[PDB]
């Protein structure tokens, strides 16, 4: 109920810890013409399912800096040949280096990349924002628009769904089978009621 992503009704908690899922929680059952059939998830004779840790899914700062230097040297070269051939980087040449550098290559393709070029002293201003807003900013050190998004949780959420037994394993814990929806595909939540 905690680590299930918010799209499936869970709280979408991020775990920087060691949590074991009991194997009794990885069992479900479905009814078909031949009757009721029961399924598990851990076919391999391994231990109980362990939820992915937000530990492993963050690249360390040193590797991040090495990647940034390598990627920006590569981009400098690519731009140098792009100017010579009277062409521009078409978002396909910069495919191997997309979310790598400290100023993420994402930022070069940002729609408002011209107005942000006139934004100076933005890190100092973001740090000093604590004296104007009554809420502490965890990302006081960086700006998403200027510095890019320096992390990704796609792999984390993918492995969290895989570790919980997928949609079938997760939804056996829920009232989804009580709704008698034929499938989970064409479904959407409503965060707030009409009233």
């Amino acid at each position: 109920v905690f680590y299930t992503p918010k799209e499936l009704g869970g709280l979408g908690m991020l775990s920087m810890g060691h949590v074991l899922i009991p194997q009794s929680d990885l069992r479900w059952s479905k009814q078909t013409d031949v009757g009721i059939t029961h399924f598990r998830s851990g076919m391999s004779h391994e231990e109980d399912q362990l939820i992915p840790n937000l530990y492993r899914y963050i690249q360390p700062w040193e590797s991040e800096f090495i990647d940034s230097q390598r990627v920006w040297a590569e981009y400098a070269l690519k731009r140098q040949e792009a100017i010579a051939q009277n062409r521009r980087l078409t978002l396909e040449d910069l495919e191997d280096s997309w979310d790598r550098g400290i100023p993420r290559i994402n930022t070069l393709f940002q729609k408002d990349r011209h107005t942000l070029a006139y934004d100076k002293g933005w890190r100092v201003r973001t740090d000093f924002k604590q004296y104007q807003v009554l809420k502490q900013n965890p990302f006081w050190w960086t700006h998403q628009r200027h510095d890019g998004k320096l992390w990704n949780l796609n792999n984390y959420r993918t492995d969290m769904i895989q570790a919980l037994g997928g949609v079938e394993g997760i939804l056996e814990h829920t009232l989804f089978k009580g709704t008698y929806f034929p499938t989970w595909e064409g479904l959407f939540w409503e965060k707030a009621s009409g009233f």
């Binding site: 810890g17 949590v19 009794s24 792999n155």
Partner: peptide, 22 residues
């Protein structure tokens, strides 16, 4: 089975932090 978040001080220390990241 308790579901309690156990500290990983000394647990899962074999693996690096670059694992399972792309």
């Amino acid at each position: 089975p308790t579901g309690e978040v156990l500290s990983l001080v000394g647990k899962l220390e074999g693996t690096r932090m670059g694992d399972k990241a792309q």
